[PDB]
Tab-separated table of C-alpha atoms and ligand atoms in Angstrom:
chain	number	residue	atom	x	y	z
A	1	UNK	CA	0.000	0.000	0.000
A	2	UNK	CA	0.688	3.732	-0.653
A	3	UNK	CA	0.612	6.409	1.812
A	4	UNK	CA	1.656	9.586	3.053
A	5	UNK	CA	3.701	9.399	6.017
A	6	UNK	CA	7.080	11.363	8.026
A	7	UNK	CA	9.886	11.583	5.635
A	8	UNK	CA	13.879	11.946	7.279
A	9	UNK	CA	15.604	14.509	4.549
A	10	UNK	CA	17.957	15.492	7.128
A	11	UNK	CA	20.162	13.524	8.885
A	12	UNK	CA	30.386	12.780	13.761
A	13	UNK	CA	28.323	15.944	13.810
A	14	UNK	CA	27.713	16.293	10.055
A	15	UNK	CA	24.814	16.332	8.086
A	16	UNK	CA	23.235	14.715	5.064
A	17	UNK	CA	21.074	15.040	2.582
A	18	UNK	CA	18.928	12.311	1.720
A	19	UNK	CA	18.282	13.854	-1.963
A	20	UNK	CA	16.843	10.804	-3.229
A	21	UNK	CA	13.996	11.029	-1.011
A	22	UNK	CA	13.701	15.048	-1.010
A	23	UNK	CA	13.334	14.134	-5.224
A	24	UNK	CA	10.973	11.674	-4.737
A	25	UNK	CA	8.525	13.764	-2.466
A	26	UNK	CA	9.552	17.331	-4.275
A	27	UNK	CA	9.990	16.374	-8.202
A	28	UNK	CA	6.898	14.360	-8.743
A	29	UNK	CA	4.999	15.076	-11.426
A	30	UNK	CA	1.654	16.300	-9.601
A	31	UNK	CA	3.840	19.118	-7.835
A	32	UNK	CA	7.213	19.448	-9.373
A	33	UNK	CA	6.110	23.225	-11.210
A	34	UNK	CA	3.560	24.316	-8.356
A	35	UNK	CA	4.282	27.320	-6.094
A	36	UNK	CA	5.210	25.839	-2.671
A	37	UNK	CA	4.290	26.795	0.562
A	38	UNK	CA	7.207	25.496	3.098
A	39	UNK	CA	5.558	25.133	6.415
A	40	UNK	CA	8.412	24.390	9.610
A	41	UNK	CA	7.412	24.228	12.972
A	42	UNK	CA	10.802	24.919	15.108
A	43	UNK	CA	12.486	25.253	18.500
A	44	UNK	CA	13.576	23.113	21.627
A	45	UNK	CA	12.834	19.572	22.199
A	46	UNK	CA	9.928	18.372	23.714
A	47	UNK	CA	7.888	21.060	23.342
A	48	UNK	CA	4.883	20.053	21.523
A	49	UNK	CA	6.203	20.448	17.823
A	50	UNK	CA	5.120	17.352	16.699
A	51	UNK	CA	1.930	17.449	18.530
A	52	UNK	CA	0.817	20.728	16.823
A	53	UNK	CA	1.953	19.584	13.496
A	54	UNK	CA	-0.256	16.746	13.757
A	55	UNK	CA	-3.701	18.849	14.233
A	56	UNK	CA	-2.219	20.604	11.269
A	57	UNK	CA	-2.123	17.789	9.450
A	58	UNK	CA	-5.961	17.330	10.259
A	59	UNK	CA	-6.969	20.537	8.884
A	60	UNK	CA	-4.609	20.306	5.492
A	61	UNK	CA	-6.493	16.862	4.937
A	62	UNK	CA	-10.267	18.809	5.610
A	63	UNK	CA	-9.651	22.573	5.376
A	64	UNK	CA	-13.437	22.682	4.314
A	65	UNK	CA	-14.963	21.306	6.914
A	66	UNK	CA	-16.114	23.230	10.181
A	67	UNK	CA	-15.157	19.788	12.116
A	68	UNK	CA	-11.662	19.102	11.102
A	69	UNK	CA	-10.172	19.423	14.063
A	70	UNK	CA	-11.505	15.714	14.746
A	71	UNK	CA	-13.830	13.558	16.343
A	72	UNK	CA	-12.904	13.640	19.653
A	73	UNK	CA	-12.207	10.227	20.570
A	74	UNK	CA	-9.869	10.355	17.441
A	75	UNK	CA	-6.521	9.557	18.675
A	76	UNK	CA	-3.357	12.010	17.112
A	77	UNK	CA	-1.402	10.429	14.481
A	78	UNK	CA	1.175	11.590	12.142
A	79	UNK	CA	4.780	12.590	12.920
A	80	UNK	CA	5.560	11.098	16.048
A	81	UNK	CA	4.787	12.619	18.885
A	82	UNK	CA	5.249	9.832	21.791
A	83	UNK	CA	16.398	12.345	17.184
A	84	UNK	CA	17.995	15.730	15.831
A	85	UNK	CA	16.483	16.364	11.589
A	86	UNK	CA	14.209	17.235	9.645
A	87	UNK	CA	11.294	15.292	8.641
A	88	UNK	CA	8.693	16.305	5.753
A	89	UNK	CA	5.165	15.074	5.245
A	90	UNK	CA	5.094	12.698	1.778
A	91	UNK	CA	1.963	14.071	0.724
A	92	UNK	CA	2.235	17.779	-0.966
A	93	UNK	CA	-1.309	19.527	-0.404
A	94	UNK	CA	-2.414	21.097	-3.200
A	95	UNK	CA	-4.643	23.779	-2.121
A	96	UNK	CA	-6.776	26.276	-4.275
A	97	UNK	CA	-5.881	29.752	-3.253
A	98	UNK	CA	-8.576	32.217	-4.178
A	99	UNK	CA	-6.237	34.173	-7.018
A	100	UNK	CA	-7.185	30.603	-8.760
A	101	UNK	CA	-3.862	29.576	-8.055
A	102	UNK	CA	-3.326	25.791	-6.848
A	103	UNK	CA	0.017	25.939	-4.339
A	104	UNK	CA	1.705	22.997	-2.899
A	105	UNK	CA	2.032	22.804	0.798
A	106	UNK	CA	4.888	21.035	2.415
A	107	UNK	CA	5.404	20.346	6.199
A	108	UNK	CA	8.384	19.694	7.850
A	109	UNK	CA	9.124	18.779	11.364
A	110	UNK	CA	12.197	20.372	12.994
A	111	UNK	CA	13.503	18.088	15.384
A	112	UNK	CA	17.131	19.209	17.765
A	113	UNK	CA	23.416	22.666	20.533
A	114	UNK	CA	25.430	23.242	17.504
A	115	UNK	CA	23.416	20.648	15.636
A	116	UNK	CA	20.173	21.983	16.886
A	117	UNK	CA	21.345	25.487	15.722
A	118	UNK	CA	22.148	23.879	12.139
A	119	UNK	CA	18.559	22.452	12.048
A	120	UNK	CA	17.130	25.908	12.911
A	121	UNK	CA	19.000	27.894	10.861
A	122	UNK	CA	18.315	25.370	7.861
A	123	UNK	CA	14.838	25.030	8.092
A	124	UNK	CA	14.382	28.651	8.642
A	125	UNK	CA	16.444	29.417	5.176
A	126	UNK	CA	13.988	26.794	3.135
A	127	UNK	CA	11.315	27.851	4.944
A	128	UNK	CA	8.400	30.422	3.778
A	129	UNK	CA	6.676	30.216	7.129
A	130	UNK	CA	8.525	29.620	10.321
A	131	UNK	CA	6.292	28.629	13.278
A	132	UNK	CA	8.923	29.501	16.183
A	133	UNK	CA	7.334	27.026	18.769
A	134	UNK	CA	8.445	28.626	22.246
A	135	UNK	CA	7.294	27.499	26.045
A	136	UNK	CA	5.633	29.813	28.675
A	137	UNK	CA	7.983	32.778	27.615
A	138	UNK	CA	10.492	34.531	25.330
A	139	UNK	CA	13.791	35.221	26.716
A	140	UNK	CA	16.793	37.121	25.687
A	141	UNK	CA	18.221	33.708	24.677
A	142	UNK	CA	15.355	33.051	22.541
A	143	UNK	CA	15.887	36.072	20.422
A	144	UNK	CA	20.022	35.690	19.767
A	145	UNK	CA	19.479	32.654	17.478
A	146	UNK	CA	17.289	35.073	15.215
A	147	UNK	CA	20.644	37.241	15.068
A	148	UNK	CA	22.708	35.208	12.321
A	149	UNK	CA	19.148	35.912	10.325
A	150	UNK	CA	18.857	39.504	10.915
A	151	UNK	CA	22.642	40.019	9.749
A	152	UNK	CA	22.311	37.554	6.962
A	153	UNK	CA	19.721	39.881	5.730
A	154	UNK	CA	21.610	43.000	6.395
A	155	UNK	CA	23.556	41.853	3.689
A	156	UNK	CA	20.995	40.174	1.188
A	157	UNK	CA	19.540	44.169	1.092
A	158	UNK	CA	22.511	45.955	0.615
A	159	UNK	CA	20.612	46.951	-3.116
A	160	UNK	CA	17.296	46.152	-2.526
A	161	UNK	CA	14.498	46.829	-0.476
A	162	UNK	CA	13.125	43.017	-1.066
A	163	UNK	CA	13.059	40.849	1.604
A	164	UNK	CA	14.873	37.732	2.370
A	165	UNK	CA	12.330	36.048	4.698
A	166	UNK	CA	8.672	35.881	4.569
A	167	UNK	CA	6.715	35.047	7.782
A	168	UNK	CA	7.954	33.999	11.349
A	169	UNK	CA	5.625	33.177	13.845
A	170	UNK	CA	6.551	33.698	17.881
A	171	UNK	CA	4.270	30.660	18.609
A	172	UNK	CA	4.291	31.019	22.549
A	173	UNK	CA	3.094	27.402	23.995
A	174	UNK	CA	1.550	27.459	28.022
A	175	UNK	CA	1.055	30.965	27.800
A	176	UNK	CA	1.529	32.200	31.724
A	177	UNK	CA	0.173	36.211	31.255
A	178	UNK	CA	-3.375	35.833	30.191
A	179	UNK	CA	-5.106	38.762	31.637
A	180	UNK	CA	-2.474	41.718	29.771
A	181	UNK	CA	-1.730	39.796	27.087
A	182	UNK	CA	-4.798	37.407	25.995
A	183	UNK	CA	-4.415	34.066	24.417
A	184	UNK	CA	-4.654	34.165	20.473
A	185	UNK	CA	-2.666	36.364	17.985
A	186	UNK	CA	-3.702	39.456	19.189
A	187	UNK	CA	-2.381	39.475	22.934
A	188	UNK	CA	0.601	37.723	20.857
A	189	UNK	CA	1.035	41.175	19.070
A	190	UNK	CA	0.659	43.125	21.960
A	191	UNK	CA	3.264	41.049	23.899
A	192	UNK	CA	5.562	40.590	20.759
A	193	UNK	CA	5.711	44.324	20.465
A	194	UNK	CA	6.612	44.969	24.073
A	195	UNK	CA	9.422	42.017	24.533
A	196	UNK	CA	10.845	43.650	20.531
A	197	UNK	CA	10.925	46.929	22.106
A	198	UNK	CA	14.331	48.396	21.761
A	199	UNK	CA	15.826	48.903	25.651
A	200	UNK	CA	19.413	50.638	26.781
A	201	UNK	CA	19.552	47.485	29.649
A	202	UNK	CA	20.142	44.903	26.630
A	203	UNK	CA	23.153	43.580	25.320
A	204	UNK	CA	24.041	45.565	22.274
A	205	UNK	CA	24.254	42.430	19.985
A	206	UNK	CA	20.281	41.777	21.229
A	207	UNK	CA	19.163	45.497	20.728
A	208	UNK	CA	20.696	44.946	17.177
A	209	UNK	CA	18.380	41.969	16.516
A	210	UNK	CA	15.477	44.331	17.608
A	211	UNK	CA	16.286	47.194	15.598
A	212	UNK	CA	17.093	45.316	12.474
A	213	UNK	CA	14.336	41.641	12.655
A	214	UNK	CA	11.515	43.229	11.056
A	215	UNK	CA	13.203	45.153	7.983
A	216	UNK	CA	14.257	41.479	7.366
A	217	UNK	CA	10.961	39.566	7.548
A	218	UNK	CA	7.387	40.522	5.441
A	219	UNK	CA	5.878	39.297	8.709
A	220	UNK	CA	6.433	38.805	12.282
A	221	UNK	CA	3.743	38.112	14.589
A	222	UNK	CA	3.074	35.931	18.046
A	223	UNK	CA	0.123	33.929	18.976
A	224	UNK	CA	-0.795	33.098	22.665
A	225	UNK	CA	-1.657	29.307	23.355
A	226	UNK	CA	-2.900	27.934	26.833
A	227	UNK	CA	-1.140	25.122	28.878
A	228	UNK	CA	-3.279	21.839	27.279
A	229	UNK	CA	-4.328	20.450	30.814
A	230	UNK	CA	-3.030	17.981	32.760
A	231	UNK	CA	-3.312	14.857	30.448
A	232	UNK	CA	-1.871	16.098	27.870
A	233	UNK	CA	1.160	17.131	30.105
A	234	UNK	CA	2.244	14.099	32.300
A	235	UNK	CA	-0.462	11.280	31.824
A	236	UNK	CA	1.527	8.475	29.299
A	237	UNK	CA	-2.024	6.574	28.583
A	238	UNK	CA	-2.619	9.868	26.632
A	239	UNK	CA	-3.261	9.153	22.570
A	240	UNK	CA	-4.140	12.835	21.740
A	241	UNK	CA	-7.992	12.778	22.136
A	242	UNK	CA	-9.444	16.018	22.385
A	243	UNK	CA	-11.627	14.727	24.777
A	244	UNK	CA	-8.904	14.415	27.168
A	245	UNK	CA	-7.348	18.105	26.105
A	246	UNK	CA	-8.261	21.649	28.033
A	247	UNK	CA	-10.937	22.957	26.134
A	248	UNK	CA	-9.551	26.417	26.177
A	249	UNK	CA	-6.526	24.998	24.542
A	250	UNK	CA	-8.793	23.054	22.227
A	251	UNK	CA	-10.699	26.811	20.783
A	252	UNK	CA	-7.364	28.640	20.609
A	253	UNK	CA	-5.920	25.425	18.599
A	254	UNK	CA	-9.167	25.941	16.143
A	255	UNK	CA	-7.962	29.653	15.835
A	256	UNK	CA	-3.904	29.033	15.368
A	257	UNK	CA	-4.364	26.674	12.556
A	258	UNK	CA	-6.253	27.974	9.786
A	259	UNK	CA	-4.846	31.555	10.916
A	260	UNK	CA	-1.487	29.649	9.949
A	261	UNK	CA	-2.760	27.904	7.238
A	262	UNK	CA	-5.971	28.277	5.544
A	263	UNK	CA	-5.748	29.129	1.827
A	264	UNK	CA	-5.499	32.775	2.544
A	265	UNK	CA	-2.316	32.379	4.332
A	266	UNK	CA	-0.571	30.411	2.312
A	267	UNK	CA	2.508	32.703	2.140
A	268	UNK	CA	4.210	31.373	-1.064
A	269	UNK	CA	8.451	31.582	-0.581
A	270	UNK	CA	9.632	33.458	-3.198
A	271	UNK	CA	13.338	34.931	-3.086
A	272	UNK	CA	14.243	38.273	-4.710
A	273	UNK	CA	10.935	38.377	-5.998
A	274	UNK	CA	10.500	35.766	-7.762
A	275	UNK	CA	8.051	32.666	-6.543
A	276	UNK	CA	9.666	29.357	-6.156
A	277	UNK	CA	8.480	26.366	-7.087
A	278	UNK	CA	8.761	22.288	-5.457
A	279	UNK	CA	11.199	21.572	-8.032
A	280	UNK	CA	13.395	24.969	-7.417
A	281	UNK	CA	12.786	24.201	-3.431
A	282	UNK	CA	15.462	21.197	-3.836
A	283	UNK	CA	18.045	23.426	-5.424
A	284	UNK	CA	17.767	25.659	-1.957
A	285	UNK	CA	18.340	22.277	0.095
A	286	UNK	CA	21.062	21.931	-2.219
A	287	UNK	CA	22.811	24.495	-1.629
A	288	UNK	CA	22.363	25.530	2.137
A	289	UNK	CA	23.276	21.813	2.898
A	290	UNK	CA	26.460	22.968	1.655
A	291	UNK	CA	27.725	25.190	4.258
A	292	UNK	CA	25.800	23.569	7.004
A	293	UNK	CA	29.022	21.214	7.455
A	294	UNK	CA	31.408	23.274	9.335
A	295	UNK	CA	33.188	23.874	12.661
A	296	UNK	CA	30.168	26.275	13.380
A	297	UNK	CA	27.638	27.978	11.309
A	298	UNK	CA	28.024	29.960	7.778
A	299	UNK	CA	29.149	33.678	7.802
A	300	UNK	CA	26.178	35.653	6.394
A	301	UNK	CA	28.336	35.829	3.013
A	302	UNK	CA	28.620	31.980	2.983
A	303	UNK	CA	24.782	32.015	3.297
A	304	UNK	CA	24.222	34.877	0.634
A	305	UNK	CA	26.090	32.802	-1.892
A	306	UNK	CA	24.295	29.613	-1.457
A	307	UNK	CA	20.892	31.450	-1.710
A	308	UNK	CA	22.496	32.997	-5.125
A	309	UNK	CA	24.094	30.048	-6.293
A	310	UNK	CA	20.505	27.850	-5.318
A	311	UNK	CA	18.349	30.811	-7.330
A	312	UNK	CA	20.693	30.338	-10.343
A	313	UNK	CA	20.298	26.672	-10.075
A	314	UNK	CA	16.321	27.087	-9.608
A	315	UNK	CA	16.322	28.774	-13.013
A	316	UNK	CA	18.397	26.686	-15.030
A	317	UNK	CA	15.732	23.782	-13.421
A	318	UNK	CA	12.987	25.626	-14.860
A	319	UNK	CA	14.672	26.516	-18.357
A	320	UNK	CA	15.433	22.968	-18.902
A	321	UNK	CA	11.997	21.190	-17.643
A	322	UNK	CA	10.492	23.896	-19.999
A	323	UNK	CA	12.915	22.946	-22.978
A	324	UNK	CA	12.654	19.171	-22.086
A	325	UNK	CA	8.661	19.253	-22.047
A	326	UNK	CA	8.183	21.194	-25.109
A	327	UNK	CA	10.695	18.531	-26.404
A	328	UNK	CA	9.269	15.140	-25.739
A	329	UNK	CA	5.732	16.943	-27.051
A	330	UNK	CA	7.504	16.572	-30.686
A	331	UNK	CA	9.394	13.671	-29.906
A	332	UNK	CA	7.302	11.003	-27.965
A	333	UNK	CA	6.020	9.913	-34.837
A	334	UNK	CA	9.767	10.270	-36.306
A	335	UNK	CA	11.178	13.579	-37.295
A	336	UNK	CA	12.787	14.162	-40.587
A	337	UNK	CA	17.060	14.901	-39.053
A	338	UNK	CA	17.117	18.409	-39.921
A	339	UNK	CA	13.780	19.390	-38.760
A	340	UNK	CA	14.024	18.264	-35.325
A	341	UNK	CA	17.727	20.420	-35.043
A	342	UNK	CA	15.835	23.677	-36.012
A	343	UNK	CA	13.603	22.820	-33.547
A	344	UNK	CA	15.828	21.661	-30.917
A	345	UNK	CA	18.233	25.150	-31.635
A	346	UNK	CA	14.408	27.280	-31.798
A	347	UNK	CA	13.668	25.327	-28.323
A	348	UNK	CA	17.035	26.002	-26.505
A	349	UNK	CA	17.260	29.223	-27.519
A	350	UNK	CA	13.641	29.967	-25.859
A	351	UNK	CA	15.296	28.455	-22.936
A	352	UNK	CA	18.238	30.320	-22.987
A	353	UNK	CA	16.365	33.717	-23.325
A	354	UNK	CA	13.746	32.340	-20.631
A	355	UNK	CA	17.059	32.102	-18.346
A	356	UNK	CA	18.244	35.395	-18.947
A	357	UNK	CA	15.269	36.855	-18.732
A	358	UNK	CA	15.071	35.721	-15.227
A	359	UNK	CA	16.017	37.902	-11.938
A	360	UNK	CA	18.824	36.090	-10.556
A	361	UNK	CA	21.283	37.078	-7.725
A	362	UNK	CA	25.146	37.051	-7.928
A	363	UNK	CA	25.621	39.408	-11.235
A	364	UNK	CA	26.210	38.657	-14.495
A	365	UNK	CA	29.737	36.932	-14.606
A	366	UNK	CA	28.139	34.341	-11.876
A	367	UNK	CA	25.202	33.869	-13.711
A	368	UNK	CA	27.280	32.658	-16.686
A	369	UNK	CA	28.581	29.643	-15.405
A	370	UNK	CA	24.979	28.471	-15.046
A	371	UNK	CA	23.866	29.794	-18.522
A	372	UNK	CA	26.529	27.110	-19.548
A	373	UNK	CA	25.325	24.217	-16.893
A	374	UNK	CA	21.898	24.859	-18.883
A	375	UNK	CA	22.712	24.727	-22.308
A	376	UNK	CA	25.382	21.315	-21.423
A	377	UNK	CA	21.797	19.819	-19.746
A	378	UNK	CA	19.872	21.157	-23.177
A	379	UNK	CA	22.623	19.878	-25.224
A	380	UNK	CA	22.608	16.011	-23.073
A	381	UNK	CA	19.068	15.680	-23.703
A	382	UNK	CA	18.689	16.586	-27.514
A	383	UNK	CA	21.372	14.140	-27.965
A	384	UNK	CA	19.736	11.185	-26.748
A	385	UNK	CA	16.401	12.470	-28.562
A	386	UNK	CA	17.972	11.793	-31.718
A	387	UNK	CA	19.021	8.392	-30.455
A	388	UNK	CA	15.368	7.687	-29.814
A	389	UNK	CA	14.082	9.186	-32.855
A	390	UNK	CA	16.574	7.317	-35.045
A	391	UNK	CA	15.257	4.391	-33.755
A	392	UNK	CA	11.746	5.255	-35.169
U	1	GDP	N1	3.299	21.310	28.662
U	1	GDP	C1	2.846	21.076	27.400
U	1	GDP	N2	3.013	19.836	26.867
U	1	GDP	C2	2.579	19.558	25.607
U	1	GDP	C3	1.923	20.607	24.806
U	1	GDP	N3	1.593	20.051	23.615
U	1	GDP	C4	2.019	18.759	23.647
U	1	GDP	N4	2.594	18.468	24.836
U	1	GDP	C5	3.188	17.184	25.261
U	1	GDP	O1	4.597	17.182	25.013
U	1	GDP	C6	5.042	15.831	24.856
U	1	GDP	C7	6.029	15.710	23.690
U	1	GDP	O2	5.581	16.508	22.587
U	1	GDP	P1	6.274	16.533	21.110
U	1	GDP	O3	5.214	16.878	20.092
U	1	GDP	O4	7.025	15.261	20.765
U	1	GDP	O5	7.279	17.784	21.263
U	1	GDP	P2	8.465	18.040	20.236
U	1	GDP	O6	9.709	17.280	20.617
U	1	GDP	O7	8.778	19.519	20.273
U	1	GDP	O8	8.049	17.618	18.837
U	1	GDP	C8	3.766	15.014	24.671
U	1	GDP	O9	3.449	14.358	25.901
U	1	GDP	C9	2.671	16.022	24.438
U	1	GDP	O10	1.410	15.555	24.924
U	1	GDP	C10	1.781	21.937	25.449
U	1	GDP	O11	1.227	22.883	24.833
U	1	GDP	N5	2.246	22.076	26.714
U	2	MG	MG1	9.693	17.366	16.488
C-alpha cells in the first residue's frame, strides 16, 4: 500500500542530505512546477512540535470542513509525537488559493546545541513560514538565534528593499500572562511588540536583533496558546484525544491553525521576488546543505552565496523542464534529421532567453557559469532524442 507518512531529509556531527527522497517527495509530477508553501514548525525539544503539526495535518487533509479538528475520541497520528532532523510530510497539499492559483504545501518537522542550531538555521532558510514554537515565555536567549538571520539579511539588502524572509511566527506554547496579554494572535502582538521593544539594559548584539528583525521579515507576529491540561502534560495513557485536552486549549488550537494555514495564508516563498516552485525548493536544500558542514555555522556571506548560487540553479531547473517538455511533445512519430535540429536550436534558444530573462542574484559573470550548466543539460538531452528518434 501507498501512503503519506514522516519523511527523514535530514540527517560525527555532520549532516546529510537524503536527496533521493527530497526528489521523490519534491519532483513528482503532480507538484514538481507548483508554487510551494514550506511550512516548519521549530524550536527546543519536547515542546509540543510534533503534537501541533499533527492537528495541522488534520486541517490540510479537511480545510473545508467546520469539524476538522476531529472527532474527539480520534486519537493524534502523524509525525511522532510519543532524534535531531528534519522530517517532511510525503503528501504535498495542493490547495486552491482564491487568485485561482493551486500551491503545494509542504510540512516539515524540525527536530534538535550546535546541531540543533544547524537544524534551525536550515529550516528557517527553506522555509516560507517559520512557526517559532516557544514554552511559557520569550527570553533574551530566545531572540540571539534570530541574530545570524537579521545580519544575513543586512547583507541580502545591501541593493534592494526586497526581503529575504517571509513570515515567522513567535508561537508562545503554556502561555503564563493571560489577563495583559490574551491568548490568540492578538495578545501575541501586543506582547511581541513589548518584549521587541528596543531597551538601553540589553546587550548591544540583542538590541541589534530588535532594531534590524523586522526590515528582514514581510511578517512577524506571536500567537498566545494555553497550557493543554493535565493529560496532555504528564499522563503516558494519553493518545491525543481532544476529549482528554483543556478545552480552552482546544478553541485557541481551532484559531492558530487555519490563521497559519488556511488558503489565505498560504505565504508562497519566493526569493528576490520571484516565486519558487517544489522543483526549485530542492536546489535551496542543495545548496544551504552545503555550508551547514562546518566547525560552526556559515558567515552571512557563505549564506548569501548559497541562496544565489541555489536561485541560479532554480532557473536553469525551470529553463530545462520547460525545454525538455516542449521537447518530448515533438518527440514522444519520427522527425525528418534536420527538422528536429531547427527545432531543438528554436527550443534552446527559448530556454536560454527564458534564463536570462530571469532575476537572478550574484551578477552577471556568476550567472554565466549556469547559462553554460543549462545549455550542457539542453545539449545532453537533444542528444539522446535523436538516439530515440533514429530508432523510429
Ligand atoms: N506542557 C505542554 N506539553 C505539551 C503541549 N503540547 C504537547 N505536549 C506534550 O509534550 C510531549 C512531547 O511533545 P512533542 O510533540 O514530541 O514535542 P516536540 O519534541 O517539540 O516535537 C507530549 O506528551 C505532548 O502531549 C503543550 O502545549 N504544553
Ligand atoms: Mg519534532
Amino acid at each position: 500500500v501507498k501512503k503519506a507518512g514522516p519523511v527523514q531529509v535530514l540527517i560525527d556531527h555532520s549532516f546529510e542530505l537524503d536527496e533521493t527522497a527530497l526528489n521523490r517527495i519534491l519532483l513528482s509530477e503532480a507538484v514538481r512546477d507548483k508554487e510551494v508553501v514550506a511550512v516548519s514548525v521549530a524550536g527546543a525539544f519536547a515542546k509540543g512540535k510534533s503534537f501541533l503539526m499533527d492537528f495541522m495535518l488534520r486541517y490540510m487533509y479537511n480545510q473545508e470542513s467546520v469539524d476538522w479538528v476531529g472527532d474527539y475520541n480520534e486519537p493524534l497520528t502523524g509525525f511522532s509525537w510519543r532524534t535531531t532532523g528534519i522530517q517532511i510530510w510525503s503528501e504535498i497539499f495542493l490547495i486552491n488559493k482564491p487568485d485561482g492559483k493551486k500551491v503545494a504545501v509542504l510540512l516539515m518537522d524540525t527536530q534538535g546545541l550546535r546541531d540543533s542550531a544547524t537544524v534551525f538555521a536550515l529550516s528557517t532558510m527553506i522555509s516560507s513560514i517559520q512557526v517559532y514554537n516557544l514554552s511559557q515565555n520569550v527570553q533574551e536567549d530566545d531572540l540571539q538565534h534570530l541574530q545570524l538571520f537579521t545580519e544575513y539579511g543586512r547583507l541580502a539588502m545591501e541593493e534592494t528593499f526586497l526581503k529575504p524572509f517571509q513570515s515567522l511566527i513567535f508561537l508562545v506554547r503554556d502561555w503564563s500572562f493571560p489577563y495583559e496579554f490574551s491568548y490568540g494572535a492578538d495578545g501575541g502582538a501586543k506582547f511581541l511588540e513589548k518584549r521587541l521593544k528596543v531597551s538601553g539594559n540589553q546587550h548591544e548584539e540583542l538590541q541589534n536583533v530588535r532594531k534590524h528583525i523586522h526590515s528582514c521579515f514581510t511578517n512577524i507576529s506571536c500567537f498566545l496558546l494555553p497550557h493543554p491540561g493535565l493529560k496532555v502534560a504528564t499522563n503516558p495513557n494519553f493518545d491525543g484525544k481532544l476529549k482528554e485536552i483543556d478545552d480552552e486549549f482546544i478553541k485557541n488550537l481551532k484559531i492558530l491553525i487555519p490563521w497559519l494555514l488556511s488558503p489565505e495564508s498560504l505565504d508562497i516563498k519566493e526569493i528576490n521576488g520571484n516565486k519558487i516552485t517544489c522543483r526549485g525548493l530542492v536546489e535551496y536544500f542543495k545548496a544551504y546543505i552545503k555550508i551547514y558542514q562546518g566547525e560552526e555555522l556559515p558567515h552571512p556571506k557563505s549564506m548569501l552565496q548559497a541562496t544565489a548560487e541555489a536561485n541560479n540553479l532554480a532557473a536553469v531547473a525551470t529553463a530545462k523542464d520547460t525545454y525538455n517538455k516542449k521537447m518530448e511533445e515533438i518527440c514522444g512519430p519520427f522527425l525528418a534529421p534536420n527538422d528536429l535540429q531547427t527545432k531543438h536550436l528554436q527550443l534552446k534558444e527559448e530556454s536560454v532567453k527564458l534564463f536570462r530573462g530571469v532575476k537572478k542574484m550574484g551578477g552577471e559573470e556568476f550567472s554565466r557559469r549556469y547559462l553554460q550548466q543549462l545549455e550542457s543539460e539542453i545539449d545532453e538531452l537533444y542528444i539522446q532524442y535523436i538516439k530515440h528518434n533514429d530508432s523510429k
